[PDB]
Amino acid sequence: FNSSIGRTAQGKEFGVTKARWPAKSVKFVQGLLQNAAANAEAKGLDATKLYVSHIQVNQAPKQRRRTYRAHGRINKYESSPSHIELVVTEKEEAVAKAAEKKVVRLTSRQRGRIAAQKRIAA
């Protein structure tokens, strides 16, 4: 959602040219972040390795309002409330156990060929 918005040099670090400085959304996100941090502290997760692994913003039911236009016409003037959710997680990913054996099927000619290579090579 950056149609017909102004450009700035503060967004150059992200590679984009059009960026803004929202206020209400930033305060709401910061409040929910502090709530998540408090929840993690209460649960027992240290804040050293906590990273925001999920976030989601959906549209809430609209609060209908009214506006007045020319020639005695009534138009649509509601809001767009947000449903915000977020999940922070402790980061821990060193290595896995890979896949299974993945047994291959060998033709008789293929088996003879590998036997020949084994017999010939040291």
Binding site: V104, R105, L106, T107, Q110
Partner: protein, 106 residues
């Protein structure tokens, strides 16, 4: 021996087609060294192989081959018609295929 080849080089030109309609079931193969149907009527019934390579092993090898046979001659330039068990992906309009010498009558 520096050369170990038991086949004949061929180029996949295109399918048996028309101005606006093409038939993927039949392809056209040009044989190097053949210029007329009189000498093109020697590689008839021979098996053509497209030998391509993928990045995933199927049954121990990453090289997969599509097989077909020469049906008849097409044109006066030595081009021949070919019918494959599975039609060529049409991305190989100019690729190199191997026409084997079997079944051999000579």
């Amino acid at each position: 021996a520096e050369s170990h080849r038991l086949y004949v080089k061929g180029k996949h030109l295109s399918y048996q087609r028309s101005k606006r309609v093409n038939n993927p079931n039949v392809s056209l193969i040009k044989i190097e060294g053949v210029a007329t149907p009189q000498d093109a009527q020697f590689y008839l019934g021979k098996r053509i192989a497209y030998v391509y390579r993928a990045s995933k092993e199927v049954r121990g090898s990453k090289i997969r081959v599509m097989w077909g046979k020469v049906t008849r001659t097409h044109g006066n330039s030595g081009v021949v018609r070919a019918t494959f068990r599975n039609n060529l992906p049409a991305k190989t309009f100019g690729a190199s295929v191997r026409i084997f010498l079997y079944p051999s009558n000579i």
